[PDB]
């Protein structure tokens, strides 16, 4: 089948190329709005920081390699503009000619993705970070302007990531958010370790803060407040690419998703939705689920791939929420329902705090876990991890449960792996269950 | 019921703990034949290389302390040498005064673990290591005799910590095995590491080797070496503390441990055993396995109490064999059956070598993942993992699968927590999955 695909990165480049491992004969063309294709998103703050400086690192793909390697063709500045749906074809505007052109298809796939908001003030001195043209752009902001003072705006991992990265490149970041509703993927109380991270290093921080006003340098606050800064970078959420898609037949949630079901299909026959773009549902319990991360990304190519070259029994279950992030020294994990999707159920929680390791071996640290149980059969919700050291590992291994459909109770049988430097005889997870 | 239990420390002194929390009135007592209680085992190589230097942390409970706290009366330095099972009493003699005395049960709780093998030679510079007296007396004889060449005889897991330990304190051991299976709870081929350690460091070893004669300092080898050392720590195994139990019914099997049902009862009413001492079966196989590990301490503790004073219907489900040491820079993990018991399936191997986490993110390390997989009903059999980083992670999260009797092929579906410090987007272990 001629196969199309719209956006060339973690879910788009991903799912042609799982094709082409089974499929050797179909043409599959990709359509990219901007300039590059396989861009590494998630390595983009450390690009900043300068922690990774080869950009080998920074772009897996460019169209050239990916065909010469792959066979599929990649078409960059090309941005799919309409879905014709009835007709099978996508309207393409080539954005270097401005000449747009039908190009047809017997299987569609859509992976648009995500854009950043951006506040909306008329600046030059204002940045978003989404894409690798963004962190081209701040990179080269900072050396002309030789940036010393930056206003961070925004709390979620993104604007984390990046605040750290100014930090550690030697620059001084601010860091002010709306409110004090902060990286809230984490349970609310549970993300103190962010503040105390940012009092250590002296890094300015104000919450329940906005700009109000900007006067080239000189930005006026919400709290009254006037400083100047030589930068601005706005994390402030996302929205989805799907307003191209609005004037075909395929359904669109109000929100502007697209909802799949666990072929990744939509309702319209022969088209496929995956990435941040697409909903589904929670694996564990029977409610919808946007997850737009890079594991699911991934997982959806390699099932639609399956779908459409190899075993199309081969089905999504559903997901299970699994996010993390580092900042400075501590790791903030957890998976499950969202904590405002709690509400919906009877819930309870255990909660317990110990080092991650043997007390007496060096180098230990706190780590805080909390587990959400359905009281009514006793089936894990939600779990949260806090720690310098190991939170990963006990998220890991919730993961692992929930997706067995595992009882609070059973994690007293957990068989961990045990020595000084890894964990306890019983282990958190154990002590979650017995604390049950 | 009155409850005695047999020896103070991981079994022991953790049931008698366990059934205090749900039991008040109960009149509970533990004997132990040496001069400490509950202390810390596994923190006793670091004791020894000075990682941990107050003791405070090698000694969890005294007597006193463990009788103000829970009201449970441990009487050290008495050895309980019989069992009267049909009268329901224990003989134990009073090592200080060397009379015996009769204590009579409701429910005899036996977890006498283990002691070390000696090699049986005439040695002042000889020792074993396998409680606090032990290494009061290594430290003591190190110090006092200006030590500095060290033999460290046995490659298990302890003599490995041990080398270490000496290495970092200042000493300049050398380490022999009488055979080149060193670390056996790990795939023979991923143990390579351990060797790499030693030569990066100049750390001497030699492997199917064995000692000759002891001439005072004057060591001779099988292999012909005569070298001189200033102490011999040997670990050439252990053997069950089980001697004062051969007269009882109690039955026994033929090397000395005591089989048990999954409410760890022996054959004789009234009378439990856990820790070292007691052999059950794995949890994801029909196979015997004796797991003589902490978790395992702690689990059948937790069950024996619930067993006497709790809920009657917990019980065991089997082990894993979840294990680990840590050695220099490298973490060895494994879980399942043991090599030589794979023999006995029709089983396949996967694996996967890959950073444990983002190639682009700094201190990157490789890390070697083995899956085992049963090739009659895809089921996980044994799992290994090898790298300076990330082990614990794989295995514990194997571990939990295993516990579910998930197969190979539904590890694709692991949703791992992904941001580049910490995995892959698609991690190794859903690596495995996709290569199988
Ligand atoms: C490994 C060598 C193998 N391990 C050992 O040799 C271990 C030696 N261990 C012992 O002697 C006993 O393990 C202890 C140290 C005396 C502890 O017994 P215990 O587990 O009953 O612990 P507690 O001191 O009573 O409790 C401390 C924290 O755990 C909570 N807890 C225990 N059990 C609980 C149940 N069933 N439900 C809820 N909570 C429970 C306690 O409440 C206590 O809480 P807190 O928050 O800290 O006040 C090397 C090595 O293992 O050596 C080091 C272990
Ligand atoms: C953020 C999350 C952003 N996520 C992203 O993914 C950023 C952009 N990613 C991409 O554009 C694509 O995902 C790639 C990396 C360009 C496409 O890679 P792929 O997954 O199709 O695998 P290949 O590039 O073909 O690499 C081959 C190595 O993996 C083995 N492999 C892949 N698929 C396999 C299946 N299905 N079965 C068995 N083996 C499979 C290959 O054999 C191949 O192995 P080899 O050892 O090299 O021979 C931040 C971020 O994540 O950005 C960075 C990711
Ligand atoms: C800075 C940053 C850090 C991140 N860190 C992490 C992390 O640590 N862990 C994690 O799990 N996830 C992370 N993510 C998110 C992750 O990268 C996304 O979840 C993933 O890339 C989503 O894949 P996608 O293909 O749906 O979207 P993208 O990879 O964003 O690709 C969508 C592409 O489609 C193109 N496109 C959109 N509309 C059109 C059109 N009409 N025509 C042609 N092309 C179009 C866009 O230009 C874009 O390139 C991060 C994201 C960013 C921005
Ligand atoms: C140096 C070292 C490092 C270790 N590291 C690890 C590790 O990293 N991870 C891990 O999982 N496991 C480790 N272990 C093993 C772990 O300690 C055991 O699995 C666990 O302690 C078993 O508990 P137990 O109660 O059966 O044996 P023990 O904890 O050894 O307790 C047995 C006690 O009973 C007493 N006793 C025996 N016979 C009698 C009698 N007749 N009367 C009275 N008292 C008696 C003994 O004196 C002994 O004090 C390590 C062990 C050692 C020695
Ligand atoms: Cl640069
Ligand atoms: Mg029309
Ligand atoms: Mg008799």
Same mark, same amino acid.
């Given at each position: 089948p001629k196969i199309v695909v719209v956006?060339? @990165?973690?879910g788009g480049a991903t799912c042609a190329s799982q094709i082409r491992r089974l499929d050797k004969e179909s043409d599959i063309i990709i359509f990219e709005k &901007?300039? $590059?294709?396989?861009?590494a998103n998630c390595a983009l703050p450390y690009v900043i920081g300068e922690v @990774?400086? $080869?950009?080998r690192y920074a772009l897996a793909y460019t169209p050239e390699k990916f065909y010469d390697r792959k066979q599929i063709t990649v078409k960059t500045?090309?941005? @799919? /503009?309409? /879905?014709?749906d009835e007709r099978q074809t996508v309207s393409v505007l080539n954005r270097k000619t401005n000449e747009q052109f039908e190009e047809s298809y017997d299987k569609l796939i859509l992976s648009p993705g995500a854009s950043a908001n951006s506040l909306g003030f008329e600046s030059d001195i204002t940045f978003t970070l989404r894409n690798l043209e963004d962190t081209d752009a701040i990179d080269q902001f900072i050396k002309a302007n030789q940036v010393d003072k930056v206003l961070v705006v925004g709390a979620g991992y993104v604007s984390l990531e990046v605040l750290e990265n100014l930090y550690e490149r030697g620059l001084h970041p601010t860091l002010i958010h709306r409110? $004090?509703?902060?990286?809230?993927?984490?349970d609310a109380d549970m993300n103190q370790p962010i503040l105390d991270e940012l009092d250590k290093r002296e890094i300015p921080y104000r919450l329940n803060?906005? /700009?109000?006003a900007i006067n080239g340098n000189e930005i006026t606050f919400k709290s009254g407040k006037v400083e100047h800064y030589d930068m601005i970078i706005e994390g402030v959420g996302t929205h989805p690419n799907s307003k191209f898609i609005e004037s075909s037949n395929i359904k669109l949630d109000r929100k502007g998703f697209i909802p799949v079901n666990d072929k990744f299909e939509?309702?319209?026959?022969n088209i496929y939705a995956i990435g941040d773009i697409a909903t589904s549902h929670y694996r564990h319990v029977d409610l919808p689920a946007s997850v737009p991360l890079a594991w699911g990304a991934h997982r959806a190519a390699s099932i639609v791939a399956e779908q459409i070259a190899?075993? &199309?029994? /081969?089905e999504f279950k559903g997901f299970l929420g699994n996010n993390i992030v580092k900042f400075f020294d501590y790791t903030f994990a957890s998976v499950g329902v969202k904590p405002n999707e709690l509400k919906q159920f009877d819930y309870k929680m255990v909660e317990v705090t110990q080092?991650?390791?043997?007390?007496?071996?060096?180098?230990n640290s706190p780590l805080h876990l909390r587990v959400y149980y359905d009281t009514?059969?006793?089936?894990?919700?939600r779990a949260a991890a806090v720690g310098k050291e190991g939170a990963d590992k006990r998220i890991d291994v919730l993961s692992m449960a929930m997706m067995n459909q595992?009882? @609070? $109770?059973?994690?007293?049988?957990?068989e961990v792996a045990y020595a000084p430097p890894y964990?306890?005889?019983? &282990?958190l997870i154990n002590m979650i269950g017995y604390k049950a």
């Open positions: 956006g060339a @990165v973690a &901007d300039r $590059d294709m396989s861009f @990774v400086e $080869d950009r500045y090309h941005e @799919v /503009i309409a /879905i014709n409110s $004090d509703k902060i990286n809230k993927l984490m803060e906005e /700009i109000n939509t309702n319209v026959p190899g075993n &199309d029994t /081969i080092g991650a390791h043997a007390n007496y071996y060096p180098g009514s059969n006793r089936q894990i919700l595992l009882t @609070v $109770d059973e994690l007293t049988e957990f964990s306890h005889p019983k &282990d």
